[PDB]
């Protein structure tokens, strides 16, 4: 049921943190105020879309974790490096 059952183990707090983690991994936020800049806001939006997409794909928190950390890896090791 719901988002493949596992949903109950990932509350909005954890979601928000993970979004933050993605954002930070993409662009290391100097201070929360930075989030107010459209440049950053776009990254925040993208991070939310990614996080949501992963959530709505993964059949387990484990898989979700893999995909999120994998995403972080790719964005640095694949993309820029």
């Amino acid at each position: 049921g719901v988002r493949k059952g596992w949903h109950e183990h990932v509350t909005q707090d954890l979601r928000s943190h993970l979004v933050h983690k993605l954002v930070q991994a993409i662009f290391p936020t100097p201070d929360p105020a930075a989030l107010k800049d459209r440049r950053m806001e776009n990254l925040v939006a993208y991070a939310k879309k990614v996080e949501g997409d992963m959530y709505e794909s993964a059949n387990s928190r484990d898989e979700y974790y893999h995909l999120l950390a994998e995403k972080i890896y790719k964005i640095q090791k694949e993309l820029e490096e």
């Binding site: 954890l14 943190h17 993970l18 983690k21 893999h66 950390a69 972080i72 890896y73 090791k77």
Partner: peptide, 28 residues
């Protein structure tokens, strides 16, 4: 399949594991 590929290859590049660990340690 793509899962397996990415995981299998990235498991050969432990910075991925460091990121996993960091994600676990950082995110509740």
């Amino acid at each position: 399949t793509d899962s397996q590929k990415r995981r299998e290859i990235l498991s050969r590049r432990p910075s991925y594991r460091k990121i996993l660990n960091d994600l676990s340690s950082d995110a509740p």
